[PDB]
Design an enzyme around this catalytic site. Sequence first.
Site, PDB file in Angstrom:
ATOM      1  CG  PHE A 252      -2.435  -7.525  10.030  1.00 37.60           C
ATOM      2  CD1 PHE A 252      -3.642  -6.608  10.282  1.00 37.60           C
ATOM      3  CD2 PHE A 252      -2.048  -8.484  10.536  1.00 37.60           C
ATOM      4  CE1 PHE A 252      -4.870  -7.556  11.645  1.00 37.60           C
ATOM      5  CE2 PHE A 252      -3.238  -9.470  11.050  1.00 37.60           C
ATOM      6  CZ  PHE A 252      -4.204  -9.022  11.490  1.00 37.60           C
TER       7      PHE A 252
ATOM      8  CG  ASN B 253      -0.272  -0.395   2.457  1.00 37.46           C
ATOM      9  OD1 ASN B 253       0.698   0.154   2.435  1.00 37.46           O
ATOM     10  ND2 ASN B 253      -0.834   0.185   4.014  1.00 37.46           N
TER      11      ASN B 253
ATOM     12  CG  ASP C 246      -9.789   8.025  10.874  1.00 37.24           C
ATOM     13  OD1 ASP C 246      -9.197   9.359  10.363  1.00 37.24           O
ATOM     14  OD2 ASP C 246     -10.656   7.004  11.031  1.00 37.24           O
TER      15      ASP C 246
END
Lengths: 129, 129, 129
Positions: free
Chosen positions: C92, C75, C81
């Site tokens: 993770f 990612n 958040d």
Amino acid sequence: TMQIKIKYLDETQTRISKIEQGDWIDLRAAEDVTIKKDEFKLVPLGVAMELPEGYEAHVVPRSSTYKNFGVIQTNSMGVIDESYKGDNDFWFFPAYALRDTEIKKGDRICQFRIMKKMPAVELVEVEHL
Amino acid sequence: TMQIKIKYLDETQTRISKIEQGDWIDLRAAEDVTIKKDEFKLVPLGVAMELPEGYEAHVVPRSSTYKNFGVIQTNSMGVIDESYKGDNDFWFFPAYALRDTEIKKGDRICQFRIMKKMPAVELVEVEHL
Amino acid sequence: TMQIKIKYLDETQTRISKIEQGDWIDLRAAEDVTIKKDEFKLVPLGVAMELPEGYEAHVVPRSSTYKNFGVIQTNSMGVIDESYKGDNDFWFFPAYALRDTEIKKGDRICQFRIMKKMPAVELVEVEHL
Ligand SMILES: [Cl-]
Ligand SMILES: [Mg+2]
Ligand code: NA
Ligand code: NA
Ligand code: NA
């Protein structure tokens, strides 16, 4: 205004040009680097810097880095602390090559900005959230 | 409140729904895109924006992007400056596919937030740090 | 100073509370993870957290993560958040292995900091920029 002290590897490093205030700042390969497909090379950027107190720098590829050089940055974004301020604390770009590629000395291959470090936090263990 | 002006490529782009303030904001592929394992495609996001003065946007993959689509963002994090505000200045997601994949028009494939640009800095060259 | 509540998977997880001064904070593998070249695994970090209100966390690999383990973060930068604060909201590291690898329980694998969420924005559609 707050300043960054920059020391270069040698006199053949193209000095970072006068900056447009606020913009991220480009960094240059310090030598020619060839990287074969599926291989990794730490690319020198021929700079070491003293960052403003309480600040850190973030380093990412330029938009056109993949297009021009077919590399990715293996750490996604490099974080450079204020403490990394010594006389031989030079900066590198960790490049993984997705194809055969040649990087030329002087090529603007990544960019950096400074940002204040996160406020002091205290982590407190709880049994349940 | 600080205003972001947004232009969509055409009538068929799904509009950015009313946001929960603070949260990163999801962006959608503007078209169907097929990408073969180990190949690269700029995925149109169907949007151009004028950001707040003194700001920039950062764009990253969504948590589920790899699992759902088997792609990475080749620039790690996209930086879009306030000056990228032209009628033709559309946003793209640079995707490298680690497997054969098909991204569908509408797919929320990345996310962005705005952040204040770095303060006034003065770079001073020094012989030693 | 700013409180963060931390819940661990079990008592074998290495507690990470120490006096902080704004440095990023290292996260660790909750168990052994073996990944084959060109394969993907979520690495458990064995922690769930309640971030300060109005804040989010960012996660990136450590500088040495690629050198030592030959993985990248799919990612690019993880965003967590304030709302991911429940009792089963464990963290993770999405690891894609560029070569055969073995992450061991207890290995530092990535690093996080907090940051204030982006201020309220109003998105306004325009016909032209
Ligand atoms: Cl640490
Ligand atoms: Mg391959
Ligand atoms: Na040069
Ligand atoms: Na759609
Ligand atoms: Na490290």
